[PDB]
Design a protein around this ligand. Structure first.
Ligand SMILES: Nc1ncnc2c1ncn2[C@@H]1O[C@H](COP(=O)(O)OP(=O)(O)OC[C@H]2O[C@@H](n3cnc4c(N)ncnc43)[C@H](OP(=O)(O)O)[C@@H]2O)[C@@H](O)[C@H]1O
Ligand SMILES: Nc1ncnc2c1ncn2[C@@H]1O[C@H](COP(=O)(O)OP(=O)(O)OC[C@H]2O[C@@H](n3cnc4c(N)ncnc43)[C@H](OP(=O)(O)O)[C@@H]2O)[C@@H](O)[C@H]1O
Ligand SMILES: Nc1ncnc2c1ncn2[C@@H]1O[C@H](COP(=O)(O)OP(=O)(O)OC[C@H]2O[C@@H](n3cnc4c(N)ncnc43)[C@H](OP(=O)(O)O)[C@@H]2O)[C@@H](O)[C@H]1O
Ligand SMILES: Nc1ncnc2c1ncn2[C@@H]1O[C@H](COP(=O)(O)OP(=O)(O)OC[C@H]2O[C@@H](n3cnc4c(N)ncnc43)[C@H](OP(=O)(O)O)[C@@H]2O)[C@@H](O)[C@H]1O
Lengths: 258, 258, 258, 258
């Protein structure tokens, strides 16, 4: 089966990658980083996010696996000492596939992006003001530092820091949180995070300034002459290769509690 | 078609009820408060909640409708001046049905309850400490004032006041928020709200004291010698009779923004 | 010098107390629990709080010291292994005095209380609604679970759990936090915590129900037929005996960070 | 008495300024924008902030007054219809002076600034990580979007949006709030806002990147090769000219409640 391996690029990670490739050399298994079916990321969640965006045009044909060389990750959930056990189990399709929802962002002047964690919007100068339209209905005028739209698996990331809820990734949804909203007798936002199902469209529209810094996972690009930013749960999903039970809520406990 | 009407019990509401009954007297329509198919609540969301619990044994055979005699409600979403237009449209099944998820609570010493808004748990004295187990996995030890588990439509209620997200009620889920958790170098909770899908079981277990004040919507009962409190998305749903489009997010805007 | 010693009442604490008394038997030092000048508390912050209220009529004539037999305390800030070094240093007034502000609560039907941590107010049934008057000016109508008024040293306690700021205890102030306020288009509270200087009077007045559960540190009493609850920074202070530098912010770091 | 008048620069404000100057032409009163003793700002709080920074080298010799041509301000607290009554009362020192605390920021590579609202710190790229040192003691390592240090009168501004407490400006203090901190099992911040008295020094030190975007009220400057950012309550104060009672908490109510 075709496979490739990305590495964080420090010694630990590069050496681990070379050993797994040697381990794969003993099986009906070929290294192909153009059309892989398995993509292994070694490092952290940032390495994993890059792996994802490296191959976002072939999401339906790939199963992703992560190894965390440092502390435990949400995406990278094998340890390095289990690398040889992983090579073996992958050798004979010894695994089921789990799919997580993704977020589609569309920027109109159309540019389109997929996010596995989130996409955010901030001003370029400059005060940030946007009208927030849900399924064509004007919901609120937001004045503040910015807004964040998170996938379910992204809810443990930036979303969490903004006061958002943690959502189980089997729920096909997206979640909008505020960054430092101005609320006074005249200016009013909802305050609360908002959780949208598939097929709901959240559209952001400028009020005066039309330049925004827009982020999609790690990527951050200043966009000029924007007319609309549109968010929706993507039709596409990320597929993970799973060899044992490691439940989301256990992943959350391990990362945040002890 | 069989129908009944509950009233807040002030003059406005009682008089409105008598007029709708007179209006229904002109159609193939009989008043039955033992086996209604339509249940009309006149007053506020508290009146509507009572209507719901009055007939919780026949949820699958009833369509609920609410009229708000005061300010706009989340459940009661006709105005009184539209009462006559409502009587007419109800006369000939001129309507589609919308269903909202509900919350099952089980108290073991089994007593079982349905909630349309939420169920909460607090101590009776007395410091509140509980172990929180998700799908048999020990997730956290909670020390604080209490916990709240909200349905999607309940997310605009007590959940909102506790920092929770607002969830679209087409999402079959429940949401757990904290009330004043103690967090220090030794005591640790997740902090964030948590959103669970159907079939996930959140169980609360005592640590020392086993007496808790437990609430289910308006009802609040001191329970003694508790071994477990179990939360899950119910298999049962509340059905609403709908005569026009009034989207959830518009309902939220109207109630919280302007 | 006259002194007494309170104990948590477990073996560790009782034995430690007996040894310090034996150690004090070797100096110009007599045990008097009616008119002490030094009050030593052995246990936790709860033991220390009790020590304080045991002698609240002689606050101006007492220096308090705490020993924490378990984890580190905010009030109890010697370890047990340093008990003998403490007995020695106390023997010859080898110490400076530090004073912390306190909170005066007045309940009118007058009953008056001092708090070292905080005083809170909740309803007895029953929905909680109160008008909040600051220096005779009507500030807001609060609807929610309750309110908490914290001293500076109390800001690390319940205040912290409610979202309040941590205040350095050299600031003569009190801080009011909300518990789960209802905020909708009709009902409005400030949301933010509020920090008042000496001589500001915060008065809470009932709207309909006049029975409230009122707490002052550990004490919690249901009060009936209340007309007013009045908060102000007390004219009286708690005095601590200090033998070495242990800064507040270091105390906060040690307890909350690592 | 020497005086000058700044204007927002729209027609309402410019015309109001010309009329007050004409009104002042009838008294022992001369217009001097180099060495004024009275500085009148017409517009909003942004206009007032600019007035302040325009004359920050002569704070001890100036009394500031604000007129709000739009909605009510925290600094600008006369209405335009009362402009003629204001000209008259100013004519014969018919007024007492009120002083508010200010914030000193020092940036070391020394550049120094005064803030009436706040100073904030964010990264230039780029992840923001800083060590936070209080009175030479290492308190925490902050990872997140940034930090905000607010004066008492600034607590109704950006501080409020970040979850901070509102402080009465007679309290000589500063208040530090977090912007979106990362908190997981490894990374730890205090979370809570922190309120410091005069003479406490909060120092921020870089960990890796040494370029930061630093804001002081409206001014925002990218600073390069920073070694330290130091915050403390300034020795200097802003003086307001006061003609009638308009208490802070009433100002807060009027702006945030109704
Ligand atoms: N202010 C703030 N607070 C919290 N999170 C932020 C903030 N700013 C950015 N981020 C997050 O950082 C990532 C950028 O990715 P990256 O390239 O790694 O850059 P970074 O700035 O390095 O990411 C920040 C941290 O977030 C961790 N991370 C990434 N994804 C998750 C999920 N899904 N749950 C929990 N923790 C996660 C990541 O783990 P890792 O250490 O890589 O194993 C880092 O520890 C972005 O998608 C945001 O979600
Ligand atoms: N501290 C606090 N904060 C917020 N909400 C609380 C709090 N304590 C209780 N409650 C809520 O109050 C209800 C009890 O119902 P009730 O008999 O009406 O008693 P109440 O104490 O009267 O209810 C409190 C308010 O909550 C409103 N309410 C009820 N349901 C909702 C939903 N789904 N969204 C938004 N607002 C709602 C209700 O509307 P209404 O005025 O009836 O049209 C009241 O204005 C309970 O289910 C909780 O969700
Ligand atoms: N829901 C909730 N959250 C946070 N704190 C609460 C809550 N409910 C009550 N409390 C606090 O608990 C105390 C009651 O005192 P007690 O008799 O000990 O009862 P408890 O319920 O045991 O107190 C709760 C905890 O608060 C600790 N505590 C007490 N004072 C402080 C200060 N000043 N800073 C930090 N931590 C503190 C105390 O330390 P300790 O363990 O005694 O050394 C306990 O760990 C009360 O004054 C409140 O401030
Ligand atoms: N994200 C976010 N949330 C809240 N406040 C922010 C935010 N970003 C910047 N700001 C504040 O905006 C100011 C910048 O001043 P400005 O030139 O006016 O620019 P702006 O971006 O226009 O200021 C934002 C708003 O803050 C108001 N403001 C200014 N000072 C105060 C105080 N002390 N209390 C309450 N409200 C206040 C001001 O009133 P005004 O309308 O001028 O009468 C504006 O309505 C800065 O000092 C921050 O405190």
């Amino acid at each position: 089966m075709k496979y490739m391996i990305t590495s964080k690029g420090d010694e630990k990670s590069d050496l681990l990658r070379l050993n797994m490739i040697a381990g794969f050399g003993e099986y009906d298994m070929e290294y192909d980083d153009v059309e892989p079916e398995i993509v292994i990321s070694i490092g952290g969640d940032g390495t994993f996010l890059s792996a994802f965006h490296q191959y976002e045009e072939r999401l339906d044909e790939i199963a992703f696996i992560g190894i965390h060389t440092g502390h435990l990750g949400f995406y990278a959930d094998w340890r390095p000492a289990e690398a040889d056990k992983l090579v073996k189990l992958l050798a004979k399709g010894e695994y089921q596939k789990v799919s997580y929802p993704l977020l589609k962002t569309t920027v109109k002047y159309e540019a389109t992006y997929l996010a596995l964690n989130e996409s955010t919007v901030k001003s370029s100068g400059g005060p940030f003001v946007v009208d927030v339209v849900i399924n064509d209905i004007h919901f609120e005028r937001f004045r503040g530092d910015g807004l964040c739209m998170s996938t379910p698996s992204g809810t443990t990331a930036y979303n969490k820091s903004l006061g958002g809820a943690l959502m189980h990734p089997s729920i096909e949804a997206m979640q909008l949180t505020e960054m430092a909203s101005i609320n006074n007798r005249v200016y009013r936002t909802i305050g609360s995070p908002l959780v949208f199902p598939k097929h709901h469209v959240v559209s952001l529209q400028p009020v005066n300034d039309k330049d925004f810094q827009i982020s999609v996972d790690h990527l951050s690009i200043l966009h000029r002459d924007v007319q609309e930013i549109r968010y929706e749960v993507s039709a596409k999903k990320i597929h993970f290769a799973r060899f044992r039970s490691f439940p989301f809520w256990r992943r959350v406990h391990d990362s945040f509690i002890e």
